[PDB]
Amino acid sequence: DFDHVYSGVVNLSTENIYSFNYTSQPDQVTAVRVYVNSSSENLNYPVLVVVRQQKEVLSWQVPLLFQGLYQRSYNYQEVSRTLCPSEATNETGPLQQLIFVDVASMAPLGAQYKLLVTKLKHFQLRTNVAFHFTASPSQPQYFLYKFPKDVDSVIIKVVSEMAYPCSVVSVQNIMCPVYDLDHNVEFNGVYQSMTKKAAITLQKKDFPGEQFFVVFVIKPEDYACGGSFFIQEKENQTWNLQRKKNLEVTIVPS
Amino acid sequence: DFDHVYSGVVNLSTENIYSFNYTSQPDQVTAVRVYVNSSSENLNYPVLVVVRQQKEVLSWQVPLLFQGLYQRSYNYQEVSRTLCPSEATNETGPLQQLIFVDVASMAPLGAQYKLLVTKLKHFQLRTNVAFHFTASPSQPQYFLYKFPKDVDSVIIKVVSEMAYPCSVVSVQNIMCPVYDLDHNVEFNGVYQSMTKKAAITLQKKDFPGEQFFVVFVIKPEDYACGGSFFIQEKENQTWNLQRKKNLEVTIVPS
Ligand SMILES: *[C@@H]1O[C@H](CO)[C@@H](O)[C@H](O)[C@H]1NC(C)=O
Ligand SMILES: *[C@@H]1O[C@H](CO)[C@@H](O)[C@H](O)[C@H]1NC(C)=O
Ligand SMILES: *[C@@H]1O[C@H](CO)[C@@H](O)[C@H](O)[C@H]1NC(C)=O
Ligand SMILES: *[C@@H]1O[C@H](CO)[C@@H](O)[C@H](O)[C@H]1NC(C)=O
Ligand SMILES: *[C@@H]1O[C@H](CO)[C@@H](O)[C@H](O)[C@H]1NC(C)=O
Ligand SMILES: *[C@@H]1O[C@H](CO)[C@@H](O)[C@H](O)[C@H]1NC(C)=O
C-alpha cells in the first residue's frame, strides 16, 4: 500500500520482499516514487535496495557514498528515485502492473531501514503553471511534459533561492531507463548546470513522441558551479548529509 | 563452483539463487567474471540478472537492448561484466568473500538462461607483455595495472585488426563501482574512442594508489567512429547480435 512507511531490520540471513500492484489508465501517467533511508552509520556494509519492474531493474546502496575531488567522501542517508512511467495509449486496458522492492545486506549485526512508496500526484507539468519542489544529491526528481497541439516551442524556466548547492537540469526523450544520476545525466539529451536560474528552449520537431522528460539532479559538491569547499580533517563529511534545494519550475509557450 | 555453466528456466513464480564463496590472498587481485545469456527472442519481458557483493549491487536486463540513432534497436543475447576487485593489503587474512547471483523475471511462459562464473586468470597486466582478448558491446572488459617502483610513466597501446566496431578505452582510479558502460564510461578519468590504434600516457603522480584500472568498452553502433549504417526495414536488428573485436594491449614504460 502506497503512502505508508514500512520499518524493518536487515542482516545476512534475512531479506524483505514487498510486492506492489497498481494500474495506470490510458492518457494518464503515474510515476512511482520510492523513499528509503537507513540509519547504519557504518560504510563497510551498506544496505542494498532494488526495485524490479516488468522490464527494468534499478538498484542502489544506502547510505549512498559520493567521492568528490580531493578524495573527500560523503555519506547520504535518505535516498529516493522515480521509476519508468509505463505509458498507455488508445489501446485501452487497466494495466495491472506490479513492482517488486527487495532489500538485503550482509552486515554482521544488521542495519535499520524505513521504506515508503507513493505515486507522484504532480508528474505531468502543466503550461504556465509554476510548481515548487525540493531536490537533493541522493534525491533526484523528474517530471513528464507533453506538448500541446497548437504550441510548437517552449521555454522551461527554473528559479531557486539559495545559490548553493550546484544543480543540473536535463531534458531527454521518452525511452527509459531515465538518466537521473550525476555521472550519467550528461550522456543523453540537453542539460545545463545552474545555481539560481536556468532555461532550455525545445522544439516539438526534435521529439518524435511530442512529449519529453525533465530531470533535476543536484550535484554532491559545488566545484562545477564555482563554489567553495570546507576543509575538514574528517574524510567522511557527516555534516554534508541533509543537503536540499527548493526549486520552482514553469514551462512558458515560446 | 566457477568454470561451470548452469542452465535454468525462469518465470513469474520461480527465481534462482546461487551463492558463490571465494578468497583473495593479499598482494593478489582476483576479479570475478559473470557470463550470462538468454534465448528469449521477446523484448516485452527481458530476464533480469543481479549480482550482489558485500558492498555493491550490479543488475542488468537480458536480452540487452540498445537504442542507437535514427531509432534503430539492437538486441544482444550474450552479456558479461566484471565485478569490483576487493583489494587486500599487508593486513593479512584469507578474506572469505561471498557473491550472490539472483535471476528472476515475469514472462508469462518464461525464458531460458545459461549462467557461467569464473575468476579472471589474467587480471593484472604485466609490463611490456602483449595480451590478446575479445570484447563486444554487451561484453565489456577491464584489467588492473599496478605501477612499478622505478618506472614513473607508462604508455598503454591497443591494436586491433578489423576497424569496426567502434570502441572506447578508458583509464580510471581504483574506487569502484567501475564505469564500464557506453553511457557512463565517459564520466570519469581518461578515455578515447578508437578503431585500430589508441595510446594513453599516464603518470603515477596523478594516481594516489599507484594502480589504475583500464576499461575496454565497445560501442553498439559506429557513428562516433565515422562508420556507416545498414538501412534495414526491421527496427529490431537481429543481425547485429554477435559483434566482436579482437584486441591486443601492451603497456610500455615511458
Ligand atoms: C497484483 O498482481 C499480483 C500478481 O500479478 C496479484 O497477486 C495481486 O492480487 C494484484 N493486486 C491486486 C490488488 O489485485
Ligand atoms: C525515513 O523516511 C521516512 C519517510 O520517507 C520518515 O518518516 C522517517 O522519519 C525517515 N527516518 C529518518 C531517520 O530520517
Ligand atoms: C483517443 O485518443 C485521443 C487523442 O489522443 C483522445 O482524445 C481520446 O480520449 C482517446 N480515446 C479514448 C477512449 O481514450
Ligand atoms: C562461504 O561463506 C558462506 C557464508 O558466509 C558459507 O556458508 C560457505 O560455507 C562458505 N564457503 C565455503 C567453501 O566454506
Ligand atoms: C551461453 O553461454 C555459455 C557459456 O557462457 C555457452 O556455453 C552457451 O553455448 C551459450 N548459449 C548460447 C545459446 O549461445
Ligand atoms: C608487505 O608489503 C610489501 C610491499 O607491499 C610486500 O613485498 C610484502 O610481501 C608484504 N608482506 C606480506 C607478509 O605479504
Residue numbers in the entry:
A (entry chain B), B (entry chain A): 47 to 300
Reproduce the article's own wording on this structure.
Human SIDT1 and SIDT2 are closely related members of the SID-1 transmembrane family, and have been implicated in various biological processes such as glucose and lipid metabolism, innate immunity, and tumorigenesis. Here, we present the cryo-electron microscopy (cryo-EM) structures of human SIDT1 and SIDT2. Both structures reveal an overall architecture of a dimeric arrangement composed of an extracellular domain (ECD) rich in β-strands and a transmembrane domain (TMD) with 11 passes, highlighting the remarkable structural congruence. Importantly, the ECDs of SIDT1 and SIDT2 bind synthetic plant-derived miRNA only under acidic conditions.
The SIDT1 ECD consists of two subdomains, ECD1 and ECD2, connected by a flexible loop. The dimer interface of the SIDT1 ECD can be divided into two regions. The first region involves hydrophobic interactions between ECD1 subdomains of two protomers, supported by hydrogen bond interactions. A conserved hydrogen bond between S105 residues is observed in SIDT1, corresponding to S92 in SIDT2. In addition, Q113 in SIDT1 may maintain a hydrogen bond interaction with N219 from the other protomer instead of the ionic bond interaction observed between R100 and D204 in SIDT2. In the SIDT2 ECD model, the dimerization interaction involves a buried surface area of ~1700 Å2 from each protomer, in contrast to ~1300 Å2 in the SIDT1 model, indicating differences in the proximity of the formed homodimers between SIDT1 and SIDT2, probably due to sequence variations. Sedimentation velocity analytical ultracentrifugation (SV-AUC) analysis further confirmed that SIDT1ECD exists as a monomer, with a sedimentation coefficient of 2.8 S and a molecular weight of ~44.6 kDa, while SIDT2ECD forms a dimer with a sedimentation coefficient of 4.8 S and a molecular weight of ~74.2 kDa.
